[PDB]
Scaffold this motif. Structure first.
Motif, PDB file in Angstrom:
ATOM      1  N   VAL A  49      -3.022 -12.294   8.579  1.00  0.00           N
ATOM      2  CA  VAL A  49      -3.158 -12.228   7.240  1.00  0.00           C
ATOM      3  C   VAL A  49      -2.494 -13.545   6.651  1.00  0.00           C
TER       4      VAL A  49
ATOM      5  N   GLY B 152       0.627  -4.095   6.773  1.00  0.00           N
ATOM      6  CA  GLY B 152      -0.695  -4.260   5.936  1.00  0.00           C
ATOM      7  C   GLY B 152      -0.551  -5.688   5.309  1.00  0.00           C
ATOM      8  N   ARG B 153      -1.608  -5.928   4.494  1.00  0.00           N
ATOM      9  CA  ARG B 153      -1.942  -7.227   3.896  1.00  0.00           C
ATOM     10  C   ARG B 153      -0.945  -7.111   2.554  1.00  0.00           C
ATOM     11  N   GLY B 154      -0.762  -8.438   2.031  1.00  0.00           N
ATOM     12  CA  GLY B 154      -0.101  -8.781   1.014  1.00  0.00           C
ATOM     13  C   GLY B 154       1.437  -9.076   1.767  1.00  0.00           C
ATOM     14  N   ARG B 155       2.541  -8.454   1.280  1.00  0.00           N
ATOM     15  CA  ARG B 155       3.976  -8.795   2.133  1.00  0.00           C
ATOM     16  C   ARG B 155       4.647  -7.627   2.325  1.00  0.00           C
ATOM     17  N   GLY B 156       3.740  -6.482   2.772  1.00  0.00           N
ATOM     18  CA  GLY B 156       4.628  -5.142   3.051  1.00  0.00           C
ATOM     19  C   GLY B 156       4.305  -4.768   4.423  1.00  0.00           C
TER      20      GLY B 156
ATOM     21  N   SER C 145       8.631 -11.611  -1.640  1.00  0.00           N
ATOM     22  CA  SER C 145       8.398 -10.869  -2.864  1.00  0.00           C
ATOM     23  C   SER C 145       9.220 -11.186  -4.107  1.00  0.00           C
TER      24      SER C 145
ATOM     25  N   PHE D 280       2.573  -9.762  -3.219  1.00  0.00           N
ATOM     26  CA  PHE D 280       2.398  -8.784  -4.046  1.00  0.00           C
ATOM     27  C   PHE D 280       3.710  -8.666  -4.839  1.00  0.00           C
TER      28      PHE D 280
ATOM     29  N   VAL E 293       7.013  -2.971  -2.271  1.00  0.00           N
ATOM     30  CA  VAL E 293       5.917  -4.206  -2.551  1.00  0.00           C
ATOM     31  C   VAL E 293       4.564  -3.470  -2.702  1.00  0.00           C
TER      32      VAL E 293
ATOM     33  N   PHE F 103      -2.978 -14.764  -2.955  1.00  0.00           N
ATOM     34  CA  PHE F 103      -2.928 -13.663  -2.619  1.00  0.00           C
ATOM     35  C   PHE F 103      -1.912 -13.127  -1.388  1.00  0.00           C
ATOM     36  N   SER F 104      -0.808 -14.135  -1.224  1.00  0.00           N
ATOM     37  CA  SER F 104      -0.149 -13.997  -0.248  1.00  0.00           C
ATOM     38  C   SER F 104       1.234 -13.152  -0.544  1.00  0.00           C
TER      39      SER F 104
END
Ligand code: SFG
Ligand code: SFG
Lengths: 318, 10, 307, 6, 309, 318, 6, 6
Positions: free
Chosen positions: A7, H1-5, A120, A261, A184, A258-259
Motif C-alpha cells: 500500500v 490497513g491502508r493509510g498509516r494505521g 501522521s 491520514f 489515525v 493518500f499515503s
C-alpha cells in the motif's frame, strides 16, 4: 508486513517529490565542471523495499551526477527484498546494510541523507531520534531530506468519532485508556472549529550545542459558534528541500496524496464551547531514553485531566 | 499562666 | 491534641532545630530538603558538573523521624511555569529531583506552592511523578485565601488598588486550586494547605473552601493581634474560622517570626490550645457518629437479606 | 455499619 | 587570627573597603551545617586562604548579602530572616556582633545602605521591604508594594531616601520615602522578562541599569518616557551589576552562565571572561587600581582580572 | 527508599562475610614483599549507602594492604549519602561515581570488583547483565566478588500460598496474571516435596568468547508423598571467594543471615501427584536486550501452560 | 516489605 | 490497513 509496503508504494506523488528534491540537491551540489568526478555519497535510511532507492537512482540519472548509494534497513524481511533487488538490477552501485542507523557505523561520511520516517503527526514514528542518531555520520556540509517538518493541530467536534473511540473499550485494560491514545482515521463526519496552528517543528541536521527532543507547546484557538469540542485533529507539513514540500494540512494538502491520514487526539469528556470563547490547549512531547509519548491537556475554557501521563496508555517504543 | 493571658485584644 | 507544626526555611542544624521545636510543643517541622538559595543546573556544562554533595544526608535522622517529624518544602527559586525555556527546563529538573529525594526520605507530606495563576507545567510534573514508582508521600498545595496581588498596600502611584466589591474577584485563588486538581485528575494524594492571611474574604468564599480537602492551615505570626497583656490573640472572625477548621481536624502550621519578642514563641501555640479547649463540646449525635464521617456504606435492604 | 448503612 | 578553621566552600559576597581591604562573606549551601562566615583580608591577593585572613568570624546562619556601613561597620543579611550589624575592633582583628534583629520573615534576599549612611533598606522573600535606622537600631518603616519575591534593591548613591526595587512580579519601583505613596512604578515599561538586578549610575543622576532573566542589560533613565537601550550580553540571568570607579564608569556584569562581561557606556562588550567553573556571585573594583576587578563565585575562587580600561 | 537500605544494613553476616572474602583476596593478591609498594584498585558496584565501602576499608586495614577505592552508584540519593560520607570520613581514598556501571568509563583498570546484586533468586536482579557490562574495565587478572552464584528450585505444596496468590487479583489486568509472576515469601506454612536442585549457574568474570545469559534447564523431582503440587520455591547459593560462601538453601542456610527470603513461582492449576510420577519441570531465562523475564512450565506428570511467555505478565527492565 | 520484597 | 494505521 508486506501488505503495508504494497500500500505504501501505491502513492506516486510522495516518491516523485522525493526524486525532485534529490535531483535539485544533486544539481546544487555538483557543478558541471566536476560532473564526472564529484561522486556524492547518498544514504537512504529506512530504505524498506527500494522505492526511495529507485527514486534516488532516477534522480541521479536524470541529473547526470555520479552517486554512490547506501541503503540501510533493520527489518530483515525487507532486507531480503533489498538484497534481491541489488543482486538483480542495481548491482554494485547500491550497498545494502542490514542494521539500525542508530547503531550502524558507516565506513565514510555521506553528503546526503534521505529518509521517509514521517508519520501522521510527523514525529509519532520517532523520526527526530533516528535522524539525530544518523547525524553522526553526515558530512559537516551534508544535507538531510526532509530538512524540516512541522506538525499542526486543530480542534474538531465529531459525535460519531467520539462514539467510535468510546467503543474501543479493550479488555484487561483501563476502561479510560482508549481516550489517551491517538488514532489515525480518515476524518469524514466531523466539524472543524478553527484553522490549524503549528504545534511542533523539527529540522535536520541539528548543529546547536544541545540536542533535545522534549518539547512543550501552548495553542489558543478562537471559537465563533456554540459547539462541543471532542478532540484535536493533527496534520503535518514537510519541506523536503527548498520549494519541494509535502503536506496533508487541508488548506495546503498535496494534490492526490493518500499515503497519510490525519491523526486524532481524543479527550475524555466533551467540552462545551460558546462563540467568543478561546480553546486553550497544551501539548507535551516527552522522552525517557526508552520511550516517546505525548501528553495533552485542555486548559480553557474548562480544565481537563492530563492525558497519557508518563506514557501510561500510549507510548512509542524507542 | 498569666490571668487573662488569652483575653481578646481591645 | 491539636496537631501543630512549625514552618522554617533556615535550619542550620537539624538536631538542635528539632530539639527546640519539640521543646516549644510543636508536633512536626516543615523544612526545605535542599538549601533554598542553592540553585542547580542540569543543561549547562560548567554548572551541571558541580562537585560535592548536593544536600545534607539522610543519616542525620532516624528513619522514623523522617517519616513522622519532617515535612518537605519546595525550593522558592523553582518556577516550572517560567516564560524562559531554559528556566522552565531547569525548574522542571530541580522539582523532579526534590520530589524524588523527598520520596527517598519517605516524608509523610511535601509542601508545594500555588502562588501564581498558571500552574499547568507544575501539575504535569507532579502528575508524572505520582505515576512513577510506589510512594505514599502526600502533597499539600499552599493556596492563599486572598491572592498576593490583592493584599498589597496602596503604595504605588501609577498602579493604585481598587475598592470595587469584586464579588467574582474574591474567588480567584479557589479557581487556581480547582484547575490544578482538575489537571491532576482529582488525585487522592493532593490536598490543600490554605494560608489564612491578615484579612478574610467573604463568608461564602470561606464556606466554599471548607468543602475542599483541606489537610493543613498556615497561620502567619503577623495575623495575631496583641492583647493588653502583650500576648498574641486573634480577631473574632479569625477565631470563628479557627473553630470551623478545628471541626475538620486540620493540621495547624505556625509560620513566620516571633513578632511578640517580649514573650516566647510557644505563646502562639498555647493560644491555639486555649482555642482547642473551650470550643463547643461534641453533642450526643456527633459523639455517636465519630469514626464514621465521609465514609461511604451501602444502604441496608432488610426485605431481601436478614440483619 | 452504623446509622442506616452497611 | 583565631578565626574559623575552614571556609564554607561557597563564596557569596565580596566588598572592597576604601582603604583596599577585602571583605568576603561565605556560606555553606550544602553539607550537614548550613552556616555562614565573614572574613577580612588586608591583602586581597592572599585570599581566600584562611591562614592569611586579617580577621574572621562565623555567623549564626547563612549570609545572603552584606554591605559596608562605613570604615568598620558591616551590615549582613542572614538566611534566618535576620538583619545584623557587626563592628571591627580598634585593631581591626576581630569581628564583633553589635546588633541583630529578626524583624524580617522568610530569608532576607538583599540589603543596601542609603546615601545618608545611617539608614539601610532590606528586601525579603516574604513580599516586603523594610527601612532601618542603624543608629537608632529600629525599623523606621515597612512596605509591601510587590506581589512576589523582592529580587533586588539598590539605594540611590546621590539622593538620600531614594532607592530602586525589583521583584519577581515584574515591577521596578523607584521608592522616594519623603512623600506619601513613595512607590513610583518607574521602569522600562517592557513586561517581557523579569528583572533580576539593578544598579545606579555613579555619575549621572536619575539614570540606572538593570538586568533580566535572558541576560539583557538595559540602560534606562528615571525622568525619561521609559526609553531604554539594551544589549543581550549574557545567555543567562544577570545576577549582579557593578559600575567602575572611573570618571566614565565601565559596567561589570556577572551572570548565571559563569561569565564576566565589562561593557562601555554604550553597552558594547569591552571585555569578557569565563575563568570561573561555577556561578559568579559578586564582583568589585579595587580602589587602588581601577583596572583590577575581583570576582567571587561558588567554585570557591577569588579571580583577579585586569581590564583594558 | 532510605528504609530499604536501613533494613539491608541490619544484617551483619552478609557484610562480615564480604569483608572476610575481600581480606582473603587482598592477602592472596599482594605478597608481603610488595606490601609497601603495591596498591590494589577496588571498585564497589552499587555501593548504596556505603556499607560495602566500609567493609572493604576494614578488610584493607586489617590485611594491611594499600588500596584505592571507587564506589559506583546510579541512585542519585544514595549518591548524595555516599558523597556526604566521603567528605566526612573516607576522604580522598574513596572516589564516588554517580553513573550506571554499564555506561561508565573508568579511568583505571580495577584489580577487584565487589558487588551485591543478588535477589532471592540468584540472578533475579540482573546481576549477570550488570557484571558483564562492568567486566570491560576489569584487569585481565582481576577478581569479581561474588565469584559465582547458583539458583535452586524445589516443588512445594501450600494451600494457603495458593489461596493468597489467587487473592492477589488486581483489577485492570489479565485475570490470571498473578500466577505468572514470582513473589518473595517466607513460606512458613508449606510442604516441600523434594530436595532443591540447581537451576542456573553464573560465574564472573566471563572470559567465554560467547557472552549470553539466555538459559534453559530441565529438572526431575522424585515424589514420595502423593500430594498436590502448588508451586516452586527458589533459593540460591553463592561462592564469594574460594571457601567464603553465602546461601539461603535450607540444608546449607547461612546461620543468622536474614537478608533474603525464598522466591515463589506459582502454578496456574494444582497438580496431584502419586508415589511415583517424577515431577518434570522446565525453566527458561530469556531476554531481548531491553527486558529480562522467566518462563516456567511443568511437563510431568501432567503438562501445564507455559507461564509468563514473552514476559507477558512479569518482566525486569534493563 | 522487610526481606527482599516490596 | 491502508493509510498509516495498524
Ligand atoms: N531505527 C531504524 N533503523 C533502521 N531502519 C529503520 C529504523 N526505523 C525504521 N526503519 C525502517 O524504515 C522503513 C520505513 C519506510 N519503509 C517507510 C516507507 C517508505 N516509502 C519506504 O519504503 O522506504 C521501514 O522498513 C523500517 O523498518
Ligand atoms: N547497573 C547499575 N549501575 C549502577 N548501580 C547499580 C546498577 N544496578 C543496580 N545498582 C545499584 O546497586 C545498589 C544495590 C545495593 N545497594 C543493594 C544492597 C547492598 N548491600 C549495598 O548496600 O550495596 C543500588 O543502590 C542500585 O541503585
Amino acid at each position: 508486513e508486506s501488505q503495508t509496503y504494497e500500500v505504501f508504494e501505491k502513492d506516486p506523488i510522495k516518491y516523485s517529490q522525493y526524486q525532485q528534491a534529490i535531483y535539485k540537491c544533486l544539481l546544487d551540489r555538483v557543478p558541471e565542471e566536476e560532473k564526472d568526478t564529484n561522486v556524492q555519497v547518498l544514504m537512504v535510511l529506512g530504505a524498506g523495499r527500494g522505492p526511495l532507492v529507485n527514486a534516488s537512482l532516477r534522480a541521479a540519472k536524470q541529473a547526470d551526477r555520479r552517486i554512490k548509494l547506501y541503503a540501510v534497513e533493520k527489518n530483515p524481511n525487507a532486507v531480503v527484498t533489498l538484497e534481491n533487488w541489488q543482486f538483480e538490477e542495481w548491482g554494485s552501485q547500491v550497498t545494502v546494510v542490514s542494521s539500525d542507523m542508530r547503531e550502524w557505523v558507516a565506513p565514510e561520511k555521506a553528503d546526503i541523507i534521505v529518509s521517509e520516517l514521517l508519520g501522521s503527526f510527523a514525529d509519532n514514528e520517532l523520526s527526530p531520534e533516528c535522524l539525530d542518531g544518523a547525524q553522526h555520520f553526515l558530512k559537516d556540509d551534508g544535507v538531510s531530506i526532509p530538512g524540516e517538518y512541522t506538525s499542526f493541530l486543530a480542534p474538531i467536534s465529531s459525535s460519531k468519532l467520539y462514539n467510535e473511540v468510546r467503543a474501543c473499550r479493550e479488555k484487561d485494560r483501563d476502561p479510560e485508556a482508549q481516550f489517551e491514545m491517538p488514532y489515525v482515521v480518515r476524518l469524514h463526519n466531523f466539524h472543524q472549529l478553527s484553522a490549524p496552528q503549528p504545534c511542533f517543528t523539527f529540522s535536520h541536521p541539528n548543529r546547536d550545542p544541545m540536542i533535545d527532543n522534549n518539547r512543550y507547546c501552548t495553542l489558543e484557538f478562537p471559537v465563533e459558534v456554540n459547539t462541543v469540542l471532542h478532540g484535536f485533529a493533527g496534520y503535518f507539513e514537510t519541506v523536503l528541500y527548498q520549494d519541494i514540500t509535502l503536506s496533508i494540512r487541508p488548506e495546503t494538502h498535496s494534490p492526490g496524496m493518500f499515503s497519510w491520514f490525519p491523526i486524532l487526539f481524543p479527550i475524555k469528556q466533551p467540552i462545551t464551547v460558546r462563540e467568543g470563547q478561546t480553546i486553550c490547549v497544551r501539548f507535551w512531547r516527552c522522552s525517557n531514553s526508552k520511550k516517546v509519548w505525548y501528553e495533552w491537556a485542555v486548559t480553557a475554557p474548562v480544565c481537563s485531566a492530563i492525558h497519557n501521563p508518563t506514557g501510561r496508555s500510549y507510548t512509542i517504543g524507542l | 499562666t498569666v490571668a487573662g493571658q488569652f483575653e481578646d485584644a481591645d | 491534641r491539636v496537631s501543630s507544626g512549625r514552618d522554617l526555611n533556615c535550619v542550620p542544624e537539624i538536631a538542635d532545630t528539632l530539639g527546640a521545636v519539640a521543646k516549644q510543643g510543636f508536633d512536626f517541622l516543615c523544612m526545605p530538603v535542599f538549601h533554598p538559595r542553592f540553585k542547580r543546573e542540569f543543561i549547562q556544562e560548567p554548572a551541571k558538573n558541580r562537585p560535592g554533595p548536593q544536600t545534607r544526608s539522610d543519616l542525620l535522622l532516624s528513619g522514623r523521624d523522617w517519616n513522622t517529624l519532617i515535612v518537605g518544602k519546595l525550593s522558592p527559586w523553582i518556577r516550572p511555569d517560567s516564560k524562559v525555556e531554559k528556566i522552565r527546563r531547569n525548574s522542571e529538573a530541580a522539582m523532579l529531583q526534590e520530589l524524588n529525594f523527598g520520596a527517598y526520605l519517605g516524608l509523610p507530606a511535601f509542601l508545594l506552592p500555588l502562588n501564581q495563576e498558571d500552574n499547568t507545567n507544575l501539575a504535569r510534573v507532579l502528575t508524572n511523578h505520582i505515576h512513577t514508582g510506589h510512594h505514599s508521600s502526600m502533597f499539600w498545595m499552599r493556596v492563599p485565601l486572598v491572592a498576593p496581588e490583592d493584599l498589597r498596600d496602596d503604595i504605588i502611584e501609577n498602579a493604585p488598588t481598587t475598592h470595587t466589591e469584586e464579588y467574582s474577584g474574591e474567588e480567584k485563588t479557589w479557581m487556581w486550586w480547582h484547575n490544578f486538581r482538575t489537571l491532576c485528575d482529582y488525585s487522592k494524594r493532593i490536598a490543600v494547605a490554605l494560608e489564612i492571611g491578615a484579612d478574610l474574604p467573604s463568608n461564602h468564599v470561606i464556606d466554599r473552601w471548607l468543602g475542599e480537602p483541606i489537610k493543613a492551615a498556615i497561620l502567619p505570626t503577623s495575623i495575631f493581634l496583641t492583647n493588653k497583656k502583650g500576648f498574641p490573640v486573634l480577631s473574632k472572625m479569625h477565631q470563628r474560622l479557627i473553630f470551623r477548621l478545628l471541626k475538620l481536624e486540620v493540621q495547624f502550621i505556625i509560620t513566620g517570626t516571633n513578632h511578640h519578642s517580649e514573650k516566647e514563641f510557644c505563646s502562639y501555640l498555647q493560644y491555639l490550645e486555649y482555642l482547642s479547649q473551650n470550643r463547643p463540646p461534641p453533642n450526643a449525635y456527633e459523639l455517636f457518629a465519630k469514626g464514621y464521617e465521609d465514609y461511604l456504606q451501602s444502604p441496608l435492604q432488610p426485605l431481601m437479606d436478614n440483619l | 455499619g452504623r446509622g442506616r448503612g452497611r | 587570627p583565631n578565626a574559623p578553621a575552614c571556609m564554607e566552600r561557597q563564596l557569596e559576597a565580596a566588598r572592597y573597603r576604601s582603604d583596599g581591604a577585602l571583605l568576603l562573606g561565605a556560606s555553606s549551601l550544602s553539607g550537614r551545617c548550613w552556616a555562614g562566615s565573614l572574613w577580612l583580608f588586608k591583602d586581597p591577593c592572599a585570599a581566600p586562604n584562611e591562614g592569611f585572613c586579617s580577621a574572621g568570624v562565623q555567623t549564626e546562619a547563612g549570609v545572603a548579602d552584606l554591605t559596608w556601613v562605613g570604615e568598620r561597620g558591616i551590615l549582613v543579611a542572614s538566611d534566618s530572616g535576620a538583619v545584623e550589624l557587626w563592628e571591627l575592633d580598634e585593631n581591626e582583628t576581630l569581628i564583633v556582633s553589635k546588633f541583630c534583629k529578626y524583624e524580617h520573615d522568610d530569608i532576607v534576599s538583599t540589603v543596601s545602605v542609603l546615601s545618608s549612611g545611617t539608614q539601610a533598606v532590606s528586601g525579603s522573600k516574604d513580599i516586603c521591604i523594610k527601612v532601618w535606622d542603624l543608629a537608632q537600631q529600629v525599623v523606621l518603616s515597612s512596605y509591601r508594594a510587590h506581589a512576589a519575591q523582592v529580587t533586588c534593591v539598590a539605594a540611590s548613591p546621590h539622593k538620600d531616601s531614594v532607592f530602586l526595587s525589583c521583584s519577581e512580579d515584574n515591577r521596578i519601583l523607584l521608592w522616594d520615602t519623603r512623600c506619601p505613596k513613595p512607590a513610583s512604578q518607574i521602569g522600562c515599561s517592557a513586561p517581557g522578562y523579569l528583572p533580576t538586578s539593578l544598579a545606579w549610575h555613579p555619575q549621572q543622576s536619575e539614570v540606572f541599569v538593570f538586568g533580566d532573566e535572558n541576560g539583557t542589560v538595559s540602560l534606562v533613565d528615571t525622568k525619561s518616557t521609559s526609553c531604554v537601550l539594551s544589549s543581550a550580553v549574557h545567555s543567562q540571568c544577570v545576577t549582579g551589576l557593578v559600575f567602575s570607579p572611573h570618571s566614565v564608569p565601565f559596567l561589570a556584569s556577572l551572570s548565571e552562565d559563569c561569565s564576566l562581561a565589562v561593557l562601555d557606556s554604550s553597552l558594547s562588550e569591552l571585555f569578557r571572561s569565563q575563568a570561573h567553573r561555577d556561578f559568579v556571585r559578586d564582583a568589585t573594583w579595587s580602589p587602588l587600581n581601577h583596572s583590577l576587578l575581583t570576582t567571587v563565585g561558588w567554585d570557591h575562587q577569588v579571580v583577579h582580572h585586569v581590564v583594558p580600561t
